[PDB]
Structures are given as C-alpha cells and as structure tokens.
Amino acid sequence: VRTIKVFTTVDNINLHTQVVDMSMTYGQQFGPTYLDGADVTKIKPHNSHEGKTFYVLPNDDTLRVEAFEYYHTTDPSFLGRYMSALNHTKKWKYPQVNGLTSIKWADNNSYLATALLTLQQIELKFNPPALQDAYYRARAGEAANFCALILAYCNKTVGELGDVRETMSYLFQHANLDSCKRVLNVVCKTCGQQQTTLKGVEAVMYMGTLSYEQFKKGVQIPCTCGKQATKYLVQQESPFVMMSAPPAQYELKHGTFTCASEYTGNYQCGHYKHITSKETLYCIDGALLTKSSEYKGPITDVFYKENSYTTTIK
C-alpha cells in the first residue's frame, strides 16, 4: 500500500499524525476533510500533501474537547461552515484604511467590514481562543480567519444578508463583559417607578434610539397599563455603549461619538458604510475613504466611549 504522512487538526495548533492510503479519498479515511478551507473530502492524497495539516470534524473525544476548548461551541456543523467561509475570505483583501484593517468589497460583505472596523475602536476581549488568535491577526492585517469565524459563529454564509446589530450581539456574547453594569429607571404617571439592573451584553446594547444623550434624558416606551412611560439611564459601568435603531436619517456630529454604521436599502437588500469620528469625520466603505466636517445619513448603530456614568436626575 502507498502512503503519506499528514496531520489532522481541529484548531490548527494541536496536530494528530496520520498515515493515509493514497488509493482512498480523504473522506473514506477521516470523514469531511479540508485543506486551508478547500473541501478535499472527495480527493485522494497527493505527494505534495505530505506533512500538511488538514482540518477534520470532531469525531473522537480528543478532537471534541480540543474543538470546544478552542471555539466554545459544540455545534456539529461549525467546523465545516468555518472552512466553507474561509475558502472565500482567504481570497478577500484587507487594506489598511486610516489605520484600521478594513475589507475590500466582495461577496456582499459590507456588514462584516463595518463590524471589523468597529471592533478596532472599542475595548473588547474575546473569550474563545479562536477569536482571540484570529482577532490579533486581523488587527495586524490578516483578517481572513477572523471574518470566517464571524460568519461561522453567526450562522451566516458568505454572500448572505447580515445585520450589524445581530452580528455584534454574537461577538459580544463571546467576549468578557462580566464587569459591565447598567441601571435603568422607568417612570409611569399611573404605576410609579421601577428600577432594573442589566449585566454583560445587555448592559452595553440598547435598541430604540441612536442617541446616548437621549437615553440619559429619557425615552418614551409603553407601560403595561397603557400609558406612555419614560425610561432613562441611572448608572452605566462599561468601556463603551452601543445605541441601535431601525435605519433613520440622523446627524453625526464630530467629537460626540466613536463610530457608527449607516444602512442604505430595505429589508431585503442594502449596503452598509462605516463612519468614524477622529480629527474629522471619515466614512469608510470597504477600501474606499472619504471625509467631511458634518455627516447625515440613515444610521443604524452608534458607538460611544464610557467608563462610569451616574445620572443627576432625582
């Protein structure tokens, strides 16, 4: 029998020596098999494959533990989906735009570009080693693995319509936000006052207004009694806050926010751009860059810097 030595892996760190029969496909010997994202399941070993690393699915206890420790998921289709995405994202270009790693437009990826740009402007530490390692590479300019992981974690395929708010929620669920705390008060003229404390991801995300200042002053929401009540921020402890809303025309003022996402389109398709407030307002659209002193557009998400806030409302 003719053979070569190859290595299998689920995390591309821990390698497992294999001797493969060159007369059988990889799939016949390992199950679904991938070589830097390419599906080689139906391929027979080549001599140039000797010594190379192949991803496989977790099909024994060692690999199951290695995969969970690296990715913090046990979804059976995760690795196949990660590899399927990577086969595309490894072909994308990741230019440095105004000091940040962006993504050249491809494969309807504008939501991923503004998510990637945003991450580089807020204080966030990921928990899965896979995201820690891939984010480090992304910041350096090699973002293919990070982008493919975002797709895999969010159960999105390359080319599929994505929402920035939902994408950030997934990423935040895999980040250490345990120190983040939000205290809110809701005041109804009929029912009185009710305080609520939120933690973790729920402490840094709000859906309903783009304005952090409005959230501090009070937003109108329905009370269960039927009257409109006012909800306002009592206390905030976090390094950033994310304020989101359905797209609406909104003015972004230099120096009053960190960055923002703009969505032009409708519920079936559209396009995202990124706005960042630095020495002026920069609009990053994949590889494209423009600047302006003022900015108005259909904004969906705005990010703000924070440390500790306490209301003066009594």
What residue ranges bind Zn ion (CB under 5 A)?
188, 190-191, 223, 225, 227
The token duo for 34 is: 């991938």
Nearer to Zn ion, 140 or 191 (CB): 191
Q: Minimal distance in Å, beta carbon 192 to Zn ion?
A: 8
Q: What share of the chain is helix, strand, coil (3-state, %, to 5)?
A: 25, 35, 40
Rounded Cα distance, 262 and 133, in Å: 29
For residues 28-52, b (16+ Cβ closer than 10 Å) or e, as one string? ebbebbbbebebbbeebbeeebeee
Nearer to Zn ion, 10 or 188 (CB): 188
Owner of token pair 């300019």: 141
Q: Minimal distance in Å, beta carbon 79 to Zn ion?
A: 50
Nearer to Zn ion, 101 or 185 (CB): 185
Q: In what order do the strands lie in the sheet with 288-292?
A: 205-207, 240-252, 295-305, 259-265, 270-277, 281-285, 288-292
11 three-class SS: coil
Q: Minimal distance in Å, beta carbon 165 to Zn ion?
A: 28
Rounded Cα distance, 65 and 241, in Å: 34
Nearer to Zn ion, 227 or 296 (CB): 227
Q: Minimal distance in Å, beta carbon 194 to Zn ion?
A: 9
CA distances from 286 to 97, 126, 213, 273, 290 (A): 9, 24, 29, 8, 11
Work out the number of other CB atoms within 10 angstroms of the CB of residue 264.
Answer: 12
Q: Minimal distance in Å, beta carbon 232 to Zn ion?
A: 16
The token duo for 89 is: 């994202």
Residue 291 C-alpha from the chain's centroid = 25
Nearer to Zn ion, 3 or 193 (CB): 193
Q: Minimal distance in Å, beta carbon 186 to Zn ion?
A: 9
Q: SS3 letters for 219-249?
A: EEEECCCCCEEEEEEEEEECCEEEEEEEEEE
Q: Minimal distance in Å, beta carbon 235 to Zn ion?
A: 23
Q: Minimal distance in Å, beta carbon 65 to Zn ion?
A: 51
169 three-class SS: helix
Nearer to Zn ion, 85 or 188 (CB): 188
Nearer to Zn ion, 224 or 266 (CB): 224
Nearer to Zn ion, 29 or 230 (CB): 230
